[PDB]
Amino acid sequence: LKKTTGLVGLAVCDTPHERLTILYTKTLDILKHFPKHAAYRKYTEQITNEKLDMVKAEPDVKKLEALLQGGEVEEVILQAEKELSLARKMLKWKPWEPLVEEPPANQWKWPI
Amino acid sequence: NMTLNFGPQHPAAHGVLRLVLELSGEMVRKCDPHIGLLHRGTEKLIEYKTYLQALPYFDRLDYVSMMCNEQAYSIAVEKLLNIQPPPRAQWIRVLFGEITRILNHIMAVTTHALDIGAMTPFFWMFEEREKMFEFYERVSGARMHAAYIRPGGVHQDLPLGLLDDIYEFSKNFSLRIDEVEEMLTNNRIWRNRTVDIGVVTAEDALNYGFSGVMLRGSGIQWDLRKTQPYDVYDQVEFDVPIGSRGDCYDRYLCRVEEMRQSLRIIEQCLNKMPPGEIKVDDAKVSPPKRAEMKTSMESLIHHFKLYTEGYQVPPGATYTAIEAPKGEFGVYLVSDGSSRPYRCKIKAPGFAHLAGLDKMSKGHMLADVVAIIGTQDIVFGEIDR
Amino acid sequence: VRPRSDVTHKQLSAFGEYVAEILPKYVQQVQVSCLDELEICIHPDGVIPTLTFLRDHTNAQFKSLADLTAVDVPTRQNRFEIVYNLLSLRFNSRIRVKTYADELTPIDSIVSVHIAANWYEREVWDMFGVFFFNHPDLRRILTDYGFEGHPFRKDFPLTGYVELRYDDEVKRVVAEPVELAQEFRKFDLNSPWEAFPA
Amino acid sequence: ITHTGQVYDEKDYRRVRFVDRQKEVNENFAIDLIAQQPVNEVEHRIIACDGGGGALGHPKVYINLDKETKTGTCGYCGLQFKQ
Amino acid sequence: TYKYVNKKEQESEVDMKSATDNAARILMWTELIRGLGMTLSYLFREPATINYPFEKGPLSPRFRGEHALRRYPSGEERCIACKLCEAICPAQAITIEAEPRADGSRRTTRYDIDMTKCIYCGFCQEACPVDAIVEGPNFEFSTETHEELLYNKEKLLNNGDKWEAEIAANIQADYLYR
Amino acid sequence: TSVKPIFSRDLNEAKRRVRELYRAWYREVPNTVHLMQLDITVKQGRDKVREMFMKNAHVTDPRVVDLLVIKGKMELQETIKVWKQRTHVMRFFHETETPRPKDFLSKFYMGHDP
Amino acid sequence: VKQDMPPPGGYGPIDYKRNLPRRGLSGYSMFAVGIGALIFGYW
Amino acid sequence: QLITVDEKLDITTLTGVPEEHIKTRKVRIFVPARNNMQSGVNNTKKWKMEFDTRERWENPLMGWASTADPLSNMVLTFSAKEDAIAFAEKNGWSYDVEEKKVPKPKSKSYGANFSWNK
Amino acid sequence: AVIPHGKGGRSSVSGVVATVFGATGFLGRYVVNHLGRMGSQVIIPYRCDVYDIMHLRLMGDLGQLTFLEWDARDKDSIRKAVQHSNVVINLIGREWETRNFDFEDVFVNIPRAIAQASKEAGVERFIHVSHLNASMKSSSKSLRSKAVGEKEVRSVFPEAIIIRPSDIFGREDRFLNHFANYRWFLAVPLVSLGFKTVKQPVYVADVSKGIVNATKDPDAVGKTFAFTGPNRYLLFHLVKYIFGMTHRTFIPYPLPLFVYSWIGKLFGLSPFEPWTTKDKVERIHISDVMPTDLPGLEDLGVQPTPLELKSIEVLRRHRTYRWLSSEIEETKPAKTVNY
Amino acid sequence: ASATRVIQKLRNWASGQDLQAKLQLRYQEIAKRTQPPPKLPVGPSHKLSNNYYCTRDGRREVVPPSIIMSSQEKKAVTPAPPMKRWELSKDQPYL
Numbered sequence A: 001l002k003k004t005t006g007l008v009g010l011a012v013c014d015t016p017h018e019r020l021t022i023l024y025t026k027t028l029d030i031l032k033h034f035p036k037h038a039a040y041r042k043y044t045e046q047i048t049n050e051k052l053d054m055v056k057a058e059p060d061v062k063k064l065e066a067l068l069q070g071g072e073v074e075e076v077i078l079q080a081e082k083e084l085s086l087a088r089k090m091l092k093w094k095p096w097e098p099l100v101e102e103p104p105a106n107q108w109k110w111p112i
Numbered sequence B: 001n002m003t004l005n006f007g008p009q010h011p012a013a014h015g016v017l018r019l020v021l022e023l024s025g026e027m028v029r030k031c032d033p034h035i036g037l038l039h040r041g042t043e044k045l046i047e048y049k050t051y052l053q054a055l056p057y058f059d060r061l062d063y064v065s066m067m068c069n070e071q072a073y074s075i076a077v078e079k080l081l082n083i084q085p086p087p088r089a090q091w092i093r094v095l096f097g098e099i100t101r102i103l104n105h106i107m108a109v110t111t112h113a114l115d116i117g118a119m120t121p122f123f124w125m126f127e128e129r130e131k132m133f134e135f136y137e138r139v140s141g142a143r144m145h146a147a148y149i150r151p152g153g154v155h156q157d158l159p160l161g162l163l164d165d166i167y168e169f170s171k172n173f174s175l176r177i178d179e180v181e182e183m184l185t186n187n188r189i190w191r192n193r194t195v196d197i198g199v200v201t202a203e204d205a206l207n208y209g210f211s212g213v214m215l216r217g218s219g220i221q222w223d224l225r226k227t228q229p230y231d232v233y234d235q236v237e238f239d240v241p242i243g244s245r246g247d248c249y250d251r252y253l254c255r256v257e258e259m260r261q262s263l264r265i266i267e268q269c270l271n272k273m274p275p276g277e278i279k280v281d282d283a284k285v286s287p288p289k290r291a292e293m294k295t296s297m298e299s300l301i302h303h304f305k306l307y308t309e310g311y312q313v314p315p316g317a318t319y320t321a322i323e324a325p326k327g328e329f330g331v332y333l334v335s336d337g338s339s340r341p342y343r344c345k346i347k348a349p350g351f352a353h354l355a356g357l358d359k360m361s362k363g364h365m366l367a368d369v370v371a372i373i374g375t376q377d378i379v380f381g382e383i384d385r
Numbered sequence C: 001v002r003p004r005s006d007v008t009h010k011q012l013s014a015f016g017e018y019v020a021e022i023l024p025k026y027v028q029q030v031q032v033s034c035l036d037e038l039e040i041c042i043h044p045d046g047v048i049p050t051l052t053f054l055r056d057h058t059n060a061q062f063k064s065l066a067d068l069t070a071v072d073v074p075t076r077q078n079r080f081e082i083v084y085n086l087l088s089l090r091f092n093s094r095i096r097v098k099t100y101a102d103e104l105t106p107i108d109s110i111v112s113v114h115i116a117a118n119w120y121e122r123e124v125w126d127m128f129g130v131f132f133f134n135h136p137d138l139r140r141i142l143t144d145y146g147f148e149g150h151p152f153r154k155d156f157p158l159t160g161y162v163e164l165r166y167d168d169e170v171k172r173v174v175a176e177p178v179e180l181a182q183e184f185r186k187f188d189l190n191s192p193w194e195a196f197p198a
Numbered sequence D: 001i002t003h004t005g006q007v008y009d010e011k012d013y014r015r016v017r018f019v020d021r022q023k024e025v026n027e028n029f030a031i032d033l034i035a036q037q038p039v040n041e042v043e044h045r046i047i048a049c050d051g052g053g054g055a056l057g058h059p060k061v062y063i064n065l066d067k068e069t070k071t072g073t074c075g076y077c078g079l080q081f082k083q
Numbered sequence E: 001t002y003k004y005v006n007k008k009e010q011e012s013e014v015d016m017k018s019a020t021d022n023a024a025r026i027l028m029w030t031e032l033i034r035g036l037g038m039t040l041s042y043l044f045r046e047p048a049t050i051n052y053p054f055e056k057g058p059l060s061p062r063f064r065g066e067h068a069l070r071r072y073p074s075g076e077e078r079c080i081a082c083k084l085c086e087a088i089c090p091a092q093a094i095t096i097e098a099e100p101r102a103d104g105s106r107r108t109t110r111y112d113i114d115m116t117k118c119i120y121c122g123f124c125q126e127a128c129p130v131d132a133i134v135e136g137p138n139f140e141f142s143t144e145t146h147e148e149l150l151y152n153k154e155k156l157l158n159n160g161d162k163w164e165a166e167i168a169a170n171i172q173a174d175y176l177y178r
Numbered sequence F: 001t002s003v004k005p006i007f008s009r010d011l012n013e014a015k016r017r018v019r020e021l022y023r024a025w026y027r028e029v030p031n032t033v034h035l036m037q038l039d040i041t042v043k044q045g046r047d048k049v050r051e052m053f054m055k056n057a058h059v060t061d062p063r064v065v066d067l068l069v070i071k072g073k074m075e076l077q078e079t080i081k082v083w084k085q086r087t088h089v090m091r092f093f094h095e096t097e098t099p100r101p102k103d104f105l106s107k108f109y110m111g112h113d114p
Numbered sequence G: 001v002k003q004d005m006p007p008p009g010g011y012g013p014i015d016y017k018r019n020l021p022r023r024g025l026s027g028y029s030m031f032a033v034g035i036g037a038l039i040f041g042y043w
Numbered sequence H: 001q002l003i004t005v006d007e008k009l010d011i012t013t014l015t016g017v018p019e020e021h022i023k024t025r026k027v028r029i030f031v032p033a034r035n036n037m038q039s040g041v042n043n044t045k046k047w048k049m050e051f052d053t054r055e056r057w058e059n060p061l062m063g064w065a066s067t068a069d070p071l072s073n074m075v076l077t078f079s080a081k082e083d084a085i086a087f088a089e090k091n092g093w094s095y096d097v098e099e100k101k102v103p104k105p106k107s108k109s110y111g112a113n114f115s116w117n118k
Numbered sequence I: 001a002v003i004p005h006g007k008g009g010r011s012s013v014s015g016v017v018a019t020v021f022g023a024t025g026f027l028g029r030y031v032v033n034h035l036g037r038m039g040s041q042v043i044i045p046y047r048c049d050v051y052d053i054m055h056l057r058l059m060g061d062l063g064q065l066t067f068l069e070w071d072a073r074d075k076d077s078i079r080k081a082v083q084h085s086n087v088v089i090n091l092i093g094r095e096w097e098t099r100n101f102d103f104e105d106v107f108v109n110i111p112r113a114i115a116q117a118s119k120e121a122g123v124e125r126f127i128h129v130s131h132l133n134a135s136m137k138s139s140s141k142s143l144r145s146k147a148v149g150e151k152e153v154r155s156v157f158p159e160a161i162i163i164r165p166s167d168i169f170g171r172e173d174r175f176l177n178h179f180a181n182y183r184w185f186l187a188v189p190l191v192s193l194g195f196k197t198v199k200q201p202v203y204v205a206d207v208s209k210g211i212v213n214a215t216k217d218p219d220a221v222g223k224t225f226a227f228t229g230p231n232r233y234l235l236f237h238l239v240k241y242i243f244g245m246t247h248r249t250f251i252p253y254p255l256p257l258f259v260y261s262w263i264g265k266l267f268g269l270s271p272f273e274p275w276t277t278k279d280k281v282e283r284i285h286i287s288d289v290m291p292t293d294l295p296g297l298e299d300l301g302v303q304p305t306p307l308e309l310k311s312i313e314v315l316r317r318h319r320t321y322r323w324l325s326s327e328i329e330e331t332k333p334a335k336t337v338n339y
Numbered sequence J: 001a002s003a004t005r006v007i008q009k010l011r012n013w014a015s016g017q018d019l020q021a022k023l024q025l026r027y028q029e030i031a032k033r034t035q036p037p038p039k040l041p042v043g044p045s046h047k048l049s050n051n052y053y054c055t056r057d058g059r060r061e062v063v064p065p066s067i068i069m070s071s072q073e074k075k076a077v078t079p080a081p082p083m084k085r086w087e088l089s090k091d092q093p094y095l
């Protein structure tokens, strides 16, 4: 429909709503393994669910671009799978855990 | 891929760049730029100097954009002190901030052509440059390396008459840009050597931290001057020249377009510069006027302490970035309560751009490498610092 | 007196909490300066994880690395304070993530997270001596090819220990221990009187 | 020779520097040039020497010409004034 | 506000007339001829160069140029060795040591500006309370030997005496501004 | 105590790496003396390598050793991938500088502060 | 009082946009010239 | 897993200092006193360690002071005595710490000056 | 005097103010190098235009090297040069008797006037340099004339050190380059086929360091040191060795000297610096004298440096691209002759 | 300037522009030197009253950074409001 996105490298993705719905539903799935009260799971699930809901609700891509911001729809696709990649990465990282180690004392005292 | 060690051959210059390269005949397989041929210690030297005596270092960091760099340190030192410059000084800094952008673009576009082989554009626009320098001199005293924009505003009000001349020039400069155009924008040959050379994707440009025309040329819309306004660049109205099909030719067109847009910003500044003072009234930060220091005791004490010891900035750290002509110029200035800084990493739009030379010039000929160093406006002072 | 909007000191503050919550395993302190700048502080092990979350999170996209630097507080056990300043072109905000590294306790490299860091990390090794694991090609960038010592360390003499001159006898440039003809006059500038409670 | 009696000894070798060259010195010496200017006979106990030219001169200072014996001398110009 | 440079708004479908116009552009190098016209045009413009020795590029009063030490009209050198010109010099160029002169006045026994060290910032011009050290107009002081560039009090005082008339005029023009 | 290992878990494993670097330099000395047309003897140079590798013989800590070879490897790279020209290499030999005596009487006769 | 300021009423307007003039002979007409030279030249 | 080392962090081998200036340089850790000229005490707060002073011969051509010692102008500032001692040990410089000496409390009261018999 | 302060390198002071009249020379260049390195005050009297002495400027530090215009025939020029020097070193010498200067002048006449003035001045010590094996009866006018000088100057300046170097080995020297340059000549004549003229070269630096050490040592007064070398050589190996490093064919063909003195006469006629000299020829085949004398090197503090060690640097320019990378190890050494 | 009309006409044509109207060389249009003396304005803080510095010294009224999350339902929050799309220019959208 559009001829091309402003960003040089990005290429127009036809069926953008379908591509987003695929990525958004996947992320939601991966997040399902995160610990229940894990902060990343609750926060990202909230963001992704709102994004899908809007993608499901809006059948016009131009208004879809306005509703979840994202500039061009193609970028939103890149951001979603980038997040999908990190969600997979953090499950391995287990950052929801407590602080690895307290800072050596006086480590953060700037006046010095 | 016989290493040629090209660049100590003064072939693209912009400073002294040993671009060790491996070339299968006339094709470049890998470019490993070497840097530090101009490292001079600017970051360590500053730790041993007071805030006002480190201002002259910033002009030398990237001296084709002499002042715009000074504004970045100014802003940074003003933030740490939570002081702001007076209204007239702000407009001045935007006036000379833009004049400086033109000066940089005339350098970048014309020096680009000299390496390409077009030599007449350089002489055409260096005469215009010359005329601009004279503004610097009649405002600061130095043709370049002024030291005019200080941490609390400008040093001295504009001479009585400069604005009028920064008009006559501006009123005409356009035609000069127009001429260059009739020689290069559509040359049947400029396009070839520039078009589709060093294309950088949008995602890759953000990833390698390009942050400049280089991003804007790829179509990413980011001008720190519109996104995060500094000084009174908010009160003016200009159009960022975004580009598509980012390549050497497109970005060029962008640099010619900001030369055009800066004339739009300069016009306004001349039309709307306010009556007022050009330096903060806090003798604490700005040095007292010489009539005052020669008649009032509190002013001498403030003059003596300011020049001998210093501002005494409150302890803290800040990263302030402006839109220097090359790209995002930022100073991370950590500061103890002392009058002399503790650290001052200068982010140079250029350390990031050079790094990209490798990911831009791939499967390219020796001549292509020369074109790409030009499209990054590399001034080795900022990269080497 | 500069104009300050508390809208930002509130927005940024909240984000700080958001990051902290999402990455509690590494975030030690998260502060907003009086200058409206956030500065999450992370354990050195959280270099990879905290950056990646910021580069690839819908509610916090921090795509470009503005700078990687290392202040050196000699007093601090962990001498260096690697500081990474990032920008989010999507949310028009910058954040700084700063970690601590001692001389012989290397930090991970983020060239993976941002390739901008390929050069700055080499710059930090050359000047301060911090080492970055998994770096593609770590090697001196700014200093001379044979330079010995890391220059921006606070314990390195400004003038340095070696200077170069051309010697006819050997017809080649030759280092010699530095001999300066007017030593750097070290003006003492600190005043014996404080300014405010701070 | 110079303002401060800087005269390389007959045996010093920096005199080689002056060999085949002029040792730069100024005939006009201040210690003497100020003397020529006469004492200003002001009629007020305390007078001020702005330095001549106001802003184009030296920091303003007030001199007490009360001592009848001596004359006040501006720490800046060296100009002397007597009551 | 943004602006697309090099973005083709639409796909103009080739029309013979259009094609010919284009083909002619490639075949008969029409745009190349356009570029030649521009340079021929200037060939006819008056050249902007100046006879350097005979004519000089204009420098206004604030030009920093070469250091000089001024003297009071009476003949007493202005410097009173407060030594903050040394304090604020960014390059460590000025070296000053002083002692009370026989008159009892304060004066500098040695004032040495190392011009090779100096980066001509003009802060010394700024800092001096008596304004004894000034940035003199002369920029032509190129020297055969490095030692000549190092300047002691006698060279600067002599430089001051030679250029005092113009220095006074220059300071006269710019002091209201400062 | 309680330190984290940089690359070598113990002086033993670390020493392995030093051996490798020595070999590297040993095999390289000859090439440099030829590709840089240096006026030195391969044997002479190879002794220099030994000198340096032992100047730091005292280090007992594994972490310090590991960095030392990282740095050492970097130097080799600058000399085999030649980015370091003769001036740089010969500096190792301290050819121009006048050697200073370490005898007390010698120093007394020459310098205020020994 | 007297400081360097924009003249009353503001300065005049300055042009910044490209003023490159699309001046040339139309392509068909152009071809004819060269073709005519050849056509005549051959005769 | 972490490894154990009882070796005092000495990193003299990595710092990159010429041998002469690591074995012949004595640094003193001291809290700066107050020039009696001023009564402010903000410069007597942080500990500083300063390297031993060395030759300052006059220069023949201009009479400027000339120094051959690189570590002369370097004075590092450390917040606490323990941290400064650590810097000397790992860098291998010899140290001789001087205990801080703070003014002892002094009892003052304006009434005394008007004492019947002082 | 000047108390010696500093660490020992440039920008330091050693307290030796020294006129050095023939500094522009091959030996000279080296003498100024060490004197400048040490931090000594060096006055360089020069006659050639400034362009040619630029090579001496970077040596020494600012205000440490002073250049004075001087003419040998004009006594006044020598007078002012030594006015403020306390050490005078004389390296005045040439191989080709020039139109306006005879071997006497360059060796005996001039070097006398110089030391003569130096005394009038009150210079603490004068070092006079004369060629090795210099009999007042030696065949080469040069050597004999030089001998004549070392005597005279002793009467103008008593207790004046007289170092007497052998032909010198160094880059830019003749001894080594001359032979190597015989390449242009297809055949390389060698009197007695390069035999019975054993020669002991000495590295230039060794000579220089030695000379400098003299200036700063009380042990040398009236001493006639002889810097010689670390190994002697029959001219045959030397010639071939040279050609060896130069990697150019060696074709030793004997040439009767009586005829060869004539060849020297030929080039000698050359207006522009004759390449060979009748007086040279003799000198070249003049056998090196034995080493029984006030020792020079080592005695004055520098251990001689073998020829083979640095030969590679002196003879490299004469090789061809093909052999440029070749190194000393690849090549063979020459053989000494304790004879 | 000072060009015979014909040269000017050739100039204007070959260039395609009225270069005469905007000559690069400057002639009697540049600000004359010795412009009149300047009496510059004194800014605020020069009042002789109600000018207490304590009420005008932002330098050190600044305080140590505010600290959150020190080591010693809830909605998602962004670094800041998502950025607003820039709008195409209206004087010259393209070119």
Ligand SMILES: NC(=O)C1=CN([C@@H]2O[C@H](COP(=O)(O)OP(=O)(O)OC[C@H]3O[C@@H](n4cnc5c(N)ncnc54)[C@H](OP(=O)(O)O)[C@@H]3O)[C@@H](O)[C@H]2O)C=CC1
Pocket (backbone or CB within 6 Å): I021, I022, I023, I024, I025, I026, I027, I028, I046, I047, I048, I072, I090, I091, I092, I093, I094, I095, I101, I105, I106, I129, I130, I131, I132, I164, I165, I166, I167, I168, I173, I174, I175
């Ligand atoms: N192989 C050797 O070099 C040996 C040398 N010596 C002795 O050592 C001394 C230095 O030798 P070397 O450096 O090779 O000699 P050079 O041929 O290099 O000349 C030495 C210097 O003498 C100066 N000089 C020569 N003639 C005159 C003159 N008529 N008037 C003024 N100055 C003059 C030259 O100055 P300019 O060029 O400006 O005229 C030159 O700088 C010689 O005197 C020689 O007798 C002894 C044994 C071996």
Ligand code: SF4
Pocket (backbone or CB within 6 Å): E078, E079, E080, E081, E082, E083, E084, E085, E086, E096, E127, E128, E129, E130, E131, E132, E133
């Ligand atoms: S400031 Fe002016 S007066 Fe004070 S010393 Fe420097 S020069 Fe002499």
Ligand SMILES: [Zn+2]
Pocket (backbone or CB within 6 Å): D049, D050, D051, D074, D075, D076, D077, D078, D079
């Ligand atoms: Zn006075």
